[PDB]
């Protein structure tokens, strides 16, 4: 079956309330009252937090609450704390010993002011050029929230092929960092006079430029 429909992301300040929607069909969410929710922190296993639409297992704080309406279940976190920043998945019994999981929702707790990103662009190293390879490495650091878009340009024209970008990861100082690579060959790297890595964060763009 198709996965239950959840919002991609959701955010709120400490002390605020947030709601995750979970839309299924009349054969699962709208049929049974067996909707469960699960919290997953980065690099860890999911955690049982909600079952039977609105029942909380032993130990889960009453900050979390559940509800259902037609084919849409909802999870509410009332009084966001830094620990609540995680991924959340809904799940519903689908009949005949089967379950269906939701697409998952990222909960962001905006407990830190906006930080503008620092962009560092490295040209292909002389060591890699001898290996008949040329990789441009764009490093973005110290930005909050952790959401950026990276675009590459060569002499002003956009470059999308050969681009690989990591999702933002938390630094040691709780800010976020991201990396993007433009993998070429020395011949293709020498065929353009200037390369640009543009990073858009919260509506503002930052650009770094290198030249062969």
């Amino acid at each position: 079956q198709s996965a239950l429909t959840q919002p991609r992301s959701v955010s709120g300040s400490p002390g605020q309330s947030v709601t995750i929607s979970c839309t299924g069909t009349s054969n699962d969410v709208g049929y049974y009252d067996h909707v469960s929710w699960y919290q997953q922190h980065p690099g860890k296993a999911p955690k049982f937090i909600i079952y039977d639409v609105s029942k909380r297992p032993s130990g889960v704080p009453d900050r979390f609450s559940g509800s259902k309406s037609d084919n849409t279940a909802s999870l509410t976190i009332s009084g966001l704390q830094a620990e609540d920043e995680a991924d959340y998945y809904c799940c519903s019994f689908a009949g005949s010993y089967t379950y269906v999981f939701g697409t998952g929702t990222k909960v962001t707790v905006l407990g830190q002011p906006k930080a503008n990103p620092t962009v560092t662009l490295f040209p292909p190293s002389s060591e890699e050029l001898q290996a008949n390879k040329a990789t441009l490495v764009c490093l973005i650091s110290d930005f909050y929230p952790g959401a950026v878009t990276v675009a590459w340009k060569a002499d002003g024209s956009p470059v999308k092929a050969g681009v690989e970008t990591t999702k933002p990861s938390k630094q040691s100082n709780n800010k976020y960092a991201a990396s993007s690579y433009l993998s070429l060959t020395p011949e293709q790297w020498k065929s353009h006079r200037s390369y640009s890595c543009q990073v858009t964060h919260e509506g503002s763009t930052v650009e770094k430029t290198v030249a062969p």
């Binding site: 955690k47 079952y51 039977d52």
Partner: peptide, 27 residues
């Protein structure tokens, strides 16, 4: 790949929860 204790049944879930995956493995 995770495993998880489960009981998709109307029968009594001994030490567990009906229609809920309460205990998960490390993956």
């Amino acid at each position: 790949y995770y495993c998880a204790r489960d009981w998709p049944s109307i029968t009594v879930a001994v030490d567990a929860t009906n229609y809920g995956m309460d205990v998960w493995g490390q993956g």
